[PDB]
Design an enzyme around this catalytic site. Structure first.
Site, PDB file in Angstrom:
ATOM      1  N   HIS A   1      64.687  82.736  35.033  1.00  0.00           N
ATOM      2  CA  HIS A   1      65.455  81.754  35.421  1.00  0.00           C
ATOM      3  C   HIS A   1      66.183  82.164  36.796  1.00  0.00           C
ATOM      4  O   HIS A   1      66.418  83.222  36.988  1.00  0.00           O
ATOM      5  CB  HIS A   1      66.480  81.560  34.379  1.00  0.00           C
ATOM      6  CG  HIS A   1      67.448  80.258  34.641  1.00  0.00           C
ATOM      7  ND1 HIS A   1      67.149  79.560  35.573  1.00  0.00           N
ATOM      8  CD2 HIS A   1      68.593  79.872  34.264  1.00  0.00           C
ATOM      9  CE1 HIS A   1      68.031  78.557  35.705  1.00  0.00           C
ATOM     10  NE2 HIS A   1      68.985  78.753  34.891  1.00  0.00           N
TER      11      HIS A   1
ATOM     12  N   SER B   1      68.859  76.508  40.733  1.00  0.00           N
ATOM     13  CA  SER B   1      68.563  75.542  39.664  1.00  0.00           C
ATOM     14  C   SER B   1      69.291  74.119  39.926  1.00  0.00           C
ATOM     15  O   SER B   1      68.838  73.496  40.725  1.00  0.00           O
ATOM     16  CB  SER B   1      69.214  76.129  38.219  1.00  0.00           C
ATOM     17  OG  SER B   1      68.986  77.642  38.315  1.00  0.00           O
TER      18      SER B   1
ATOM     19  N   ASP C   1      59.017  78.412  35.245  1.00  0.00           N
ATOM     20  CA  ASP C   1      60.660  78.576  35.008  1.00  0.00           C
ATOM     21  C   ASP C   1      61.176  78.291  33.561  1.00  0.00           C
ATOM     22  O   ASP C   1      60.955  77.379  32.870  1.00  0.00           O
ATOM     23  CB  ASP C   1      61.383  77.288  36.109  1.00  0.00           C
ATOM     24  CG  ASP C   1      63.095  77.745  36.130  1.00  0.00           C
ATOM     25  OD1 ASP C   1      63.293  78.421  36.703  1.00  0.00           O
ATOM     26  OD2 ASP C   1      63.573  76.870  35.400  1.00  0.00           O
TER      27      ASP C   1
HETATM   28  C1  LIG Z   1      67.767  68.129  37.627  1.00  0.00           C
HETATM   29  C2  LIG Z   1      67.753  69.505  36.735  1.00  0.00           C
HETATM   30  C3  LIG Z   1      68.506  70.405  36.557  1.00  0.00           C
HETATM   31  C4  LIG Z   1      68.112  71.329  35.711  1.00  0.00           C
HETATM   32  C5  LIG Z   1      68.457  72.645  35.405  1.00  0.00           C
HETATM   33  O1  LIG Z   1      67.967  73.532  34.532  1.00  0.00           O
HETATM   34  O2  LIG Z   1      69.643  73.154  36.152  1.00  0.00           O
HETATM   35  C6  LIG Z   1      67.074  70.825  35.017  1.00  0.00           C
HETATM   36  C7  LIG Z   1      66.294  71.380  33.719  1.00  0.00           C
HETATM   37  N1  LIG Z   1      66.868  69.691  35.640  1.00  0.00           N
HETATM   38  C8  LIG Z   1      66.059  68.386  35.166  1.00  0.00           C
HETATM   39  C9  LIG Z   1      64.799  68.918  34.414  1.00  0.00           C
HETATM   40  C10 LIG Z   1      64.577  68.263  35.996  1.00  0.00           C
END
Ligand SMILES: Cc1cc(C(=O)O)c(C)n1C1CC1
Ligand SMILES: *[C@@H]1O[C@H](CO)[C@@H](O)[C@H](O)[C@H]1NC(C)=O
Length: 359
Positions: A303, A146, A254
């Site tokens: 997830h 993630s 996701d």
């Molecule tokens: C960079 C990032 C990390 C996470 C995460 O869920 O941990 C998410 C949703 N994003 C941005 C949507 C790109």
């Protein structure tokens, strides 16, 4: 058999609250492979959301309460049954306590409330590991899930460069990015960017990268240039600019992607508009992976994956992720007969792959 906490000896490399960052370590002295795992856990892109994260998720911002040991699970396990890929490796788990998708590379000013030092944390963990056998390593696999998977993409080339600058050119630095390959797409239903879990992906990273003063890989920075570096947090844009081998693991649907897109499936009837949205999302994700040669992208709503106990169960086209990763190792010793590395589902709906996790 349990990794042991070490707080960074360079006291200036801190978690959000100024407490020392650290890493957990389980040594395997017969192995020259090192797995450095970046933990995930979203981010906080402004004062108000960080102050609330400090109330409710303080351990993602502070080391004061970390336990002195952790159990390695999934790809971090030493048991062959749980980790057929790299069970004998040297195992490192780097807790996520900078809330910056591992991009922050600046000492906190007295003018700011929190320190965002994610990229410096990684650097200092690698440096201190050198004196703990890392210096004799043949392969350093920087992995993460993630936010840590996105951290892998932002940091894998800096690690390669740090080890070359430090005099260890023979260590092969590789990346395994799990569930950190996001689309900067339009939301299914519009929401104001008020909080972490429902702020559109583009505005989240635009705000965050400024708030954390985040740094991105150099060649990607030079393409998008000043004020557009937020682009480099999105795998399909930054990945072509990376030099290091990177294997990408990514659910086509996701749950974090869906959440920032304001999609909630509650088993309720899915009207045509949402069906079209979800199908096009899986198609766009498939499209961004066509030129990622080492990838594992099952058509599931889930997830993250690689540190869960049962990460061995999912298959794409008949091949598990542990096998795909072993075929990737082999390819780095073009396509190998019987040993595929490009495993992207083509069916168009969550769970059309029957091996998706049911949890
Ligand atoms: C960079 C990032 C990390 C996470 C995460 O869920 O941990 C998410 C949703 N994003 C941005 C949507 C790109
Ligand atoms: C310690 O960390 C700081 C980062 O604030 C870095 O600039 C410095 O060079 C490091 N040096 C040592 C010896 O730890």
């Amino acid at each position: 058999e349990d990794l042991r906490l070490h707080l960074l000896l360079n006291t200036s490399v801190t978690c959000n609250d100024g407490s020392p960052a650290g890493y957990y370590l389980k040594e395997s002295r017969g192995s020259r492979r090192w797995l450095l795992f970046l933990e995930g856990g979203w981010y906080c892109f402004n004062r108000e959301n960080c102050d609330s994260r400090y109330d409710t998720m303080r351990r993602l911002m502070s080391s004061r309460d970390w336990p002195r040991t952790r159990t390695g699970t999934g790809i971090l396990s030493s048991q062959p049954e749980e980790n057929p890929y790299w069970w004998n490796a040297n195992m490192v788990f780097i807790p996520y306590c900078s809330s910056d998708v591992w991009s922050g590379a600046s000492s906190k000013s007295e003018k700011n409330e929190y320190a965002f030092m994610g990229a410096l944390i990684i650097q200092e963990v690698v440096r201190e590991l050198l004196g703990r056998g890392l210096s004799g390593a043949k392969v350093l696999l920087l992995a993460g899930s993630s936010a840590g998977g996105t951290g892998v993409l932002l940091n894998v080339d800096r690690v390669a460069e740090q080890l070359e600058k430090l005099g260890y050119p023979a260590i092969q630095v590789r990346g395994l990015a799990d569930s950190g390959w996001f689309l900067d797409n339009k939301q299914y239903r519009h929401t104001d960017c008020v909080d972490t879990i429902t702020c559109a992906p583009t505005e989240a990273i635009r705000r965050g990268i400024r708030y954390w003063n985040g740094v991105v890989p150099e060649r990607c920075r030079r393409q998008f240039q000043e004020g557009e570096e937020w682009n480099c947090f999105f795998g399909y844009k930054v990945y072509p600019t990376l030099r290091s081998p990177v294997f990408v693991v990514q659910w086509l649907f996701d749950e974090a992607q869906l959440t920032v897109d304001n999609v909630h499936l509650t088993g309720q009837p899915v009207q045509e508009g949402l069906r079209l949205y979800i199908q096009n999302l899986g198609r766009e994700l498939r499209h961004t992976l066509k030129d990622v040669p080492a990838s594992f992208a099952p058509a599931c709503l889930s997830h993250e994956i690689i540190i869960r106990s049962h990460w061995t169960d999912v298959q794409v086209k008949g091949t598990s992720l542990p096998r795909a990763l072993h075929c990737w190792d082999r390819s780095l010793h073009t396509p190998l007969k019987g040993c595929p590395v490009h495993l992207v589902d083509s069916c168009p709906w969550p769970h059309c792959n029957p091996s998706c996790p049911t949890g």
